[PDB]
Symmetry: C3
Subunit: 139 residues, 3 copies
């Protein structure tokens, strides 16, 4: 049960707004709180492993993004949570262990990890939410 950081970082960002939504500057991922329905896709996270034929690929969430076996995006001020489910788009088997989401089998896996809203959270306060995931391997 140990994660070894070894890889790069993917940052999933979402700006939550009200129905009257004012987009300023370049396009970013934004949704009204009413769109935060159960299983709503937030976005994909690409994963490409190399040199892991004998290790279990893994992603570790920043400390501020997990608690009690649950993952969540966190607001800029660290106060507000948006609970999510993390799931590879393929049929591969993974396990969650204290902020770590690791593959059950060894191998240099490449694939897409989807981030989805876990439970309708249409009362989420408007703000900027982030989930940070770092590549590495588990054992």
């Amino acid at each position: 049960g140990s994660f070894t950081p070894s890889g790069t970082t993917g940052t999933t960002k979402l700006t939550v707004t009200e129905k009257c939504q004012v987009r300023v500057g370049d396009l970013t991922v934004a949704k009204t709180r009413g769109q935060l329905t159960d299983a709503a896709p937030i976005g994909p996270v690409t994963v490409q492993a190399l040199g892991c034929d004998a290790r279990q690929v893994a992603l570790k969430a920043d400390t501020d993004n997990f608690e009690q076996g649950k993952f969540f995006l966190i607001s800029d001020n660290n106060r507000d949570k948006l609970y999510v489910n993390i799931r590879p788009t393929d049929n591969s088997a993974w396990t969650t262990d204290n902020g770590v989401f690791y593959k059950n089998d060894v191998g240099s896996w490449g694939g897409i990890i989807g981030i989805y809203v876990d439970g309708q959270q249409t009362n989420t306060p408007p703000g900027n939410y982030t989930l940070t995931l770092t590549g590495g391997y588990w054992a």
Copy 2:
């Protein structure tokens, strides 16, 4: 007189330099202090509102970017100001209220907000200057 944050953030950045100017890395917006003449354009800010047929679109500047009914870009160290005027490129009417720049009429407005140097400031200390504007609505 209340701003409700609801939208994304646009960041206007400018690096001020001397006449001998050394650009390192990728292109960014940079000017010599001698170019900071009155009404000099710093750059455009896009605004695209959705679902605001019954609200007044608004942009709020970060606390560090306004004081006394005046807006300004602020240096990285929070010390130096570059006073600017904020004005939509179209003929629409807006109002300034304590760091908030709001549209006089309701509607899902889309347009360009220009950022211009307010008063010649050719003695501005070289540094990195930023103005941050967040989308939302006023009332």
Copy 3:
């Protein structure tokens, strides 16, 4: 012996990993620690000077990136160093002076500055390393 900041900033980033390397999200510069051999290229830094016909172009490294006439990328936590050599790809002559790398002759130089691993450092701890260089002129 004085650097005057006047120009923009170039940030050289490198993520060091183990042999089992898990890339998450968009492509960034990453190497296994085994690739950190002597003279290994980390990446180029573009420099384009304007209005410097009578000044010596210069780049100053952030305080956290130099000590004792040596430059280094520094880990996110400020603890770990990756010593590098900084060298223009052309035949021009430069001098190092306390975190400052300046050109020996005046002129509005444009060119590429290469960043190379200085001494094999294959035991470098996995992490994110950065070197920040700001444009200006020396005298």
